[PDB]
Amino acid sequence: MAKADYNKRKPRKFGKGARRCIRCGQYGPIIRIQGLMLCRHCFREVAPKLGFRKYE
Amino acid sequence: MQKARIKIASTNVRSLDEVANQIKQIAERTGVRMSGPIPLPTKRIRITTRKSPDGEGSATFDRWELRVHKRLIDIEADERAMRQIMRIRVPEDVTIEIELIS
Amino acid sequence: MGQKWKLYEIKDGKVIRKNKFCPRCGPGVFMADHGDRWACGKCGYTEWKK
Amino acid sequence: FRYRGYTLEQLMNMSLEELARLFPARQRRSLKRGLTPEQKKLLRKIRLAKKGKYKKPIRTHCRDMIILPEMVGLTIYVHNGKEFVPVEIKPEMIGHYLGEFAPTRKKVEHG
Amino acid sequence: MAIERYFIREAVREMLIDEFLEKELRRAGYGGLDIKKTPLGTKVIIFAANPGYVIGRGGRRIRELTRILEKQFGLENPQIEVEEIKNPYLNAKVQAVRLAQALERGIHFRRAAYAALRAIMNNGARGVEIRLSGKLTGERAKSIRFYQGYLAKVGNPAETLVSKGYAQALLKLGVIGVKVAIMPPG
Amino acid sequence: MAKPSYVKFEVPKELAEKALQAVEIARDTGKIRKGTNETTKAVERGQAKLVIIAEDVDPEEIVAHLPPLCEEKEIPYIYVPSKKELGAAAGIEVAAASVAIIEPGKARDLVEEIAMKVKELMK
RNA sequence: AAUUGGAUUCAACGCCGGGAACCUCACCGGGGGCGACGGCAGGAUGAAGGCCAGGCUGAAGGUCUUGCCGGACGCGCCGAGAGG
């Protein structure tokens, strides 16, 4: 038949479902918001190139 | 003349000190009176994180350091005597801020 | 698609337009004349008969 | 005081503002801030039923509406999640939620 | 925002461009990206064993790389430069990507291991390791460990001194993980 | 327009190609009409110079009145033997069972030659 | 009605969950709906997209009755995609 567009159109103003990462594309899995939105799992793989240091 | 503040921070130790030292050496001799390169704090940033992606058994937990250090420099020179001193190469990776007041 | 849509009437050496032309916007936009309720054509507007 | 409020009729004529001083903190808020674009199509179907154009049996997913004095009388069909469970609305139902009266679980014994 | 966040913003900027360019420039032979960041036009320095692939097959790839750089960033005039890596055999991440292609190709395990070991030891490697975790063409989870000379020590002045290159060499029956850990003289 | 049964004058295979190509420059420089319901208005007011009409329109509603009316307006008509052969010709790569060139633009040396040669023979 | 799933002795049970009112969300109930690229037959004799108004929908021209515009190309299957 005929119908108008959809790409989702519901409220998602805030919460976890609001967020997605810039590496594994998730809502519920982790989003470290410091201007580095990724999951905890990516974070570990990425950091030595970031310049974070393992040492306590 | 115009009292300028060079506020210079860097993410690593070796990169910040070489620029601070070089800035106090080249400026020393010309039409500049310069107050010494003062170290302010390290706003050490702690990210404290869960290693294991299972979150299972014992999970060993990474401590993260991001240390950002800030040297500050007052200087009495022109806006032209300022660019002459801002010629320098500068590590990647070194933020140099300039406020200008009389 | 949906044929047939030849709703413009024919004179002998002229044409005439069956449907109504809108009075909210200017000419160039025809009315789905329901008899009391006018739809719009360019975009889709709830208009009542004047 | 039998019948909740001053009298069933005088709270249909006080609607906007004057009801508020009587109501809970929670019912006030949702009237005062307003309700969603599905709550605007439910103000046509209570109005088709009291008078005029052929009345629909009013159905709703509204479980966040708090019962007003004008809506007392209609038989309201509140979707429990599977099916529509009826509620004949009374004047003792002024000041309670609409999602209270219809169920949120099937009602049986535990064991 | 502040001092703290911006540095992390920049470093996040490094990853999004280093992740894509690796995966593309496996034909070239990817080894790094020296990223010079300015308000005029972001100047990325792509590191390849070979510059003749990165340019492309007639200008296409260098323009393609100029064109996807405008989409990610807000510097719409990003330059491209190709610097050679001076020893690609001293670089492990090159040897990982180079080994991955050869296992993609189907050449046998210990053979595809021997050559690799031999080309980088000739180059000047105090010591070298290749590990290959994977199916190993059956259905048991066993790695094969190819070993010569010194290796990564203890602590962290371990991992800084050595090189380390990782690459998923795809197959059509499964997968094989390609780890190559090089120890340069130092 | 026309049918596959109306053959009143000849349309050579050399004069129908020049009229597929003097209608293609007509859309990419000037103005063109296309879709038969908008064309059934452009020959009749007097906005068309040379009509060109494809031979496959049926049902008849805009096909019984337009062979005797177009000889009374002083306008010549010319045949394409298909809707997909007048469509590609129209300017575009999609059908057009009728067209009305309002304004020759860069087709002007070719649309005065084909409109006297068809009017000479029979409109 | 569904109480999403996985985890299970140490080493599953403040575990994946570093954030479940909608969102999340994968479950249930109800209303509504996209299928690339090729082949095949169809085309502009006007939309594939939009839309009053009732009649229907918990709402959405969504659906029917009903009447119509802006400018111009897409079903049904058959290999075979994107998505999960």
Side-chain angles (χ1 to χ4, degrees):
Chain A
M1 316 215 220
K3 96 291 160 49
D5 85 315
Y6 58 65
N7 44 255
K8 296 191 182 291
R9 40 178 191 179
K10 57 193 162 193
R12 57 183 151 282
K13 188 170 194 297
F14 55 16
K16 297 298 307 194
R19 309 295 198 285
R20 296 197 309 116
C21 297
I22 200 158
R23 196 164 192 232
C24 74
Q26 308 300 322
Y27 295 107
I30 308 99
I31 310 93
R32 179 77 208 174
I33 191 158
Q34 279 297 331
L36 33 72
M37 54 195 113
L38 298 171
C39 73
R40 192 167 70 231
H41 329 136
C42 310
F43 204 53
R44 286 203 56 207
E45 297 162 64
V46 171
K49 305 192 194 158
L50 303 181
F52 281 85
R53 304 282 66 217
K54 201 184 286 290
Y55 46 52
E56 303 214 353
Chain B
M1 290 200 200
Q2 177 177 246
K3 93 175 71 170
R5 148 168 23 264
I6 309 169
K7 180 198 314 206
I8 178 175
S10 203
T11 188
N12 59 283
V13 159
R14 304 178 64 88
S15 294
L16 191 53
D17 194 39
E18 200 171 326
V19 181
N21 189 236
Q22 187 173 345
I23 287 164
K24 82 158 296 310
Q25 197 179 343
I26 194 173
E28 197 57 58
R29 304 305 308 272
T30 174
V32 168
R33 184 192 290 171
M34 199 194 161
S35 187
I38 86 176
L40 303 172
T42 305
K43 300 305 286 196
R44 247 186 303 98
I45 144 274
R46 225 164 248 166
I47 285 176
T48 52
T49 69
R50 251 181 214 162
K51 267 174 136 98
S52 317
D54 273 30
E56 186 52 276
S58 184
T60 290
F61 305 134
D62 273 305
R63 213 188 214 185
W64 302 85
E65 304 177 7
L66 208 169
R67 312 203 165 194
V68 272
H69 355 285
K70 194 173 283 101
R71 317 277 169 284
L72 190 141
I73 283 169
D74 293 82
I75 165 165
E76 183 162 302
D78 308 280
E79 201 193 57
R80 187 182 170 276
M82 176 52 55
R83 187 184 176 269
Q84 201 277 117
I85 292 159
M86 202 160 263
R87 185 68 179 277
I88 186 177
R89 61 216 295 116
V90 299
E92 306 85 76
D93 307 327
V94 155
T95 287
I96 317 179
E97 283 180 65
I98 193 75
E99 198 212 60
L100 291 312
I101 54 161
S102 276
Chain C
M1 298 191 71
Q3 307 154 59
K4 194 157 196 176
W5 215 56
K6 182 69 185 189
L7 308 154
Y8 319 112
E9 304 171 20
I10 314 100
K11 300 173 164 178
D12 300 273
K14 293 188 159 42
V15 266
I16 206 74
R17 267 74 71 191
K18 185 168 188 299
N19 297 104
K20 299 190 99 279
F21 295 85
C22 214
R24 327 304 194 116
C25 291
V29 44
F30 288 82
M31 295 287 91
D33 294 294
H34 190 51
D36 85 310
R37 286 280 192 177
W38 281 340
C40 212
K42 288 183 190 285
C43 54
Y45 208 57
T46 301
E47 311 169 14
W48 173 77
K49 189 180 275 290
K50 283 178 67 265
Chain D
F1 187 79
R2 194 184 276 270
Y3 320 113
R4 268 65 211 171
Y6 283 104
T7 170
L8 178 62
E9 298 290 294
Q10 271 288 129
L11 313 158
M12 295 177 161
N13 299 326
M14 281 165 53
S15 297
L16 310 175
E17 196 88 24
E18 298 286 329
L19 297 182
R21 184 231 170 200
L22 312 166
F23 296 165
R26 309 174 298 205
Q27 176 168 14
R28 290 159 61 151
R29 189 168 231 69
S30 241
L31 200 69
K32 280 290 166 194
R33 300 289 173 89
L35 277 157
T36 183
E38 189 174 315
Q39 199 55 65
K40 297 178 193 175
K41 298 305 312 315
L42 208 76
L43 294 175
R44 191 196 161 206
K45 299 165 67 168
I46 66 175
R47 229 81 74 194
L48 297 199
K50 296 158 185 171
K51 45 169 177 72
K53 296 195 171 191
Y54 192 49
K55 66 171 281 185
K56 297 182 184 66
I58 187 176
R59 294 148 297 192
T60 204
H61 283 207
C62 302
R63 296 168 59 76
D64 278 279
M65 194 70 194
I66 327 94
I67 273 60
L68 187 72
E70 303 201 68
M71 297 177 80
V72 174
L74 297 159
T75 49
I76 191 157
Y77 286 85
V78 193
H79 202 60
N80 93 330
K82 189 179 72 190
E83 60 162 295
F84 294 96
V85 184
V87 198
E88 171 63 299
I89 309 177
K90 306 181 293 196
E92 304 190 282
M93 304 190 190
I94 301 160
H96 292 300
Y97 281 88
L98 176 53
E100 288 173 31
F101 325 137
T104 207
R105 74 193 198 86
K106 209 76 196 173
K107 316 291 284 197
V108 296
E109 291 185 45
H110 305 280
Chain E
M1 210 176 309
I3 301 308
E4 212 153 80
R5 334 289 194 282
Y6 177 60
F7 279 124
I8 40 176
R9 215 155 289 185
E10 289 188 313
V12 169
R13 197 175 303 279
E14 297 179 68
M15 178 38 89
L16 315 172
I17 194 80
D18 220 38
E19 186 180 280
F20 302 150
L21 256 62
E22 199 175 5
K23 288 154 187 82
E24 178 187 349
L25 301 166
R26 301 191 186 185
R27 188 182 76 137
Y30 204 69
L33 192 76
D34 257 5
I35 186 157
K36 285 191 186 180
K37 275 153 284 196
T38 321
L40 191 70
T42 306
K43 307 197 281 290
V44 303
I45 310 171
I46 303 170
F47 269 76
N50 288 296
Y53 297 113
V54 175
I55 292 168
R57 318 170 281 289
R60 264 172 280 193
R61 184 173 271 196
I62 190 168
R63 290 193 251 95
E64 273 173 286
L65 293 158
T66 313
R67 275 172 288 171
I68 195 139
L69 266 164
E70 300 174 13
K71 305 178 198 168
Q72 299 184 242
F73 308 160
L75 291 305
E76 309 270 311
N77 297 122
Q79 271 205 317
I80 316 291
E81 270 83 43
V82 196
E83 276 207 57
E84 59 177 34
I85 312 144
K86 278 77 87 192
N87 298 313
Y89 306 108
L90 197 64
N91 196 327
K93 205 176 199 174
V94 184
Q95 286 313 292
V97 171
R98 206 205 78 181
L99 190 56
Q101 295 303 305
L103 295 148
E104 282 149 46
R105 279 189 208 121
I107 305 176
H108 286 90
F109 296 127
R110 180 176 316 166
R111 292 199 107 177
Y114 196 90
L117 286 172
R118 188 173 52 108
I120 61 188
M121 91 169 318
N122 195 240
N123 204 256
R126 192 160 179 197
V128 297
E129 177 178 318
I130 314 169
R131 203 169 187 189
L132 288 157
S133 327
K135 206 156 75 85
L136 300 185
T137 189
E139 299 181 33
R140 293 296 293 105
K142 196 74 176 172
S143 302
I144 183 161
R145 174 177 187 244
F146 295 91
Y147 217 68
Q148 303 201 311
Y150 288 88
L151 195 71
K153 299 276 204 92
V154 177
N156 283 239
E159 68 148 340
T160 303
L161 298 171
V162 305
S163 192
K164 177 52 161 67
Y166 171 73
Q168 199 185 57
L170 186 81
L171 311 168
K172 62 289 313 159
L173 292 173
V175 277
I176 190 165
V178 180
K179 273 185 169 48
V180 181
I182 289 171
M183 188 170 162
Chain F
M1 293 62 215
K3 300 189 79 72
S5 323
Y6 297 167
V7 175
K8 301 178 177 291
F9 45 89
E10 189 60 43
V11 180
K13 203 178 292 298
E14 75 193 69
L15 197 62
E17 286 191 29
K18 303 304 179 284
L20 297 204
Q21 292 287 341
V23 174
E24 179 178 279
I25 300 165
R27 188 183 180 273
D28 295 301
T29 324
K31 300 296 199 163
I32 203 83
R33 306 268 67 106
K34 44 176 191 164
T36 304
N37 302 353
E38 186 95 75
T39 311
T40 307
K41 307 167 185 171
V43 72
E44 289 178 341
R45 291 165 181 166
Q47 303 289 118
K49 307 283 173 178
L50 158 67
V51 267
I52 178 159
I53 58 192
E55 291 180 294
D56 77 318
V57 194
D58 176 51
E60 298 190 301
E61 188 175 307
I62 64 270
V63 203
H65 77 254
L66 223 105
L69 186 72
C70 298
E71 307 186 53
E72 298 175 344
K73 314 295 291 187
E74 311 283 60
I75 182 169
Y77 47 101
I78 187 171
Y79 299 133
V80 195
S82 229
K83 166 174 47 168
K84 279 83 206 63
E85 285 187 41
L86 188 51
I92 204 144
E93 62 177 322
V94 159
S98 195
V99 164
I101 186 174
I102 305 175
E103 178 184 19
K106 293 196 176 184
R108 64 167 67 83
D109 192 43
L110 322 160
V111 176
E112 83 188 314
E113 294 169 12
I114 301 160
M116 293 182 207
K117 186 183 181 191
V118 179
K119 185 163 100 291
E120 206 173 309
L121 189 52
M122 173 189 173
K123 300 173 186 78

